[PDB]
Design a protein around this nucleic acid. Structure first.
Lengths: 92, 15, 91
DNA sequence: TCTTATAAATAGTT
DNA sequence: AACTATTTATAAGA
């Protein structure tokens, strides 16, 4: 960007909406690339601050959810907490 | 209860 | 990267796994950032080539899934086809 | 929406 | 596992 931003809630409503649309596209594009490069099936669910639902699926959202339900447990499960932790470890 | 959530998700999508 | 790559399947099993781990982290990190910056709840489901499930949730995967079922209709719905089309319009 | 300067991710060596 | 040149993403401007 023109400036480094801190990873912290954006307060200006309009800045938030603009960042949201941009980074959402950027998130989906990364997912697209991963799914092709590495032969992954991906589903992504986003609820924005107003609880609008946005979704992406490499090929089929329904197939992937149905698959998820047939698997008893995830081979890996991460949350924001875990991501923060990895970053701390990764250092600079 | 992940098994409940999975079963509710299952029924939703299927219906 | 040191060179541009095409968006195509990686055939070298080792290159694939290495890219897979790097990019998976990258994607989750973007999701983390988005969830905090714009106050959002996010769930990610990934099945790799070997059909091993990896998942991420800003806060709670179960809650996100539970919420999903209460919407009859996604407010926006994209697939690879959609992303491929958007990129076309921009080279 | 676009442009762009700049920050951030990553492909290829190491 | 490291590093870094290079590609990609994006914040701020317009």
């Amino acid at each position: 960007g023109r400036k480094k931003i801190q990873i912290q809630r954006i307060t200006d409503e309009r800045n938030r909406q603009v960042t949201f649309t941009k980074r959402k596209f950027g998130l989906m594009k990364k997912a697209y690339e991963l799914s092709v490069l590495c032969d992954c099936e991906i589903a992504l669910i986003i609820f924005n601050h107003s609880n609008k639902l946005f979704q992406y699926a490499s090929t089929d959202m329904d197939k992937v959810l149905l698959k998820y339900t047939e698997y008893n447990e995830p081979h890996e499960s991460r949350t924001n907490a875990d991501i923060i932790e990895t970053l701390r470890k990764k250092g600079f | 209860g992940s098994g409940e959530v999975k079963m509710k998700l299952q029924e939703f999508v299927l219906n």
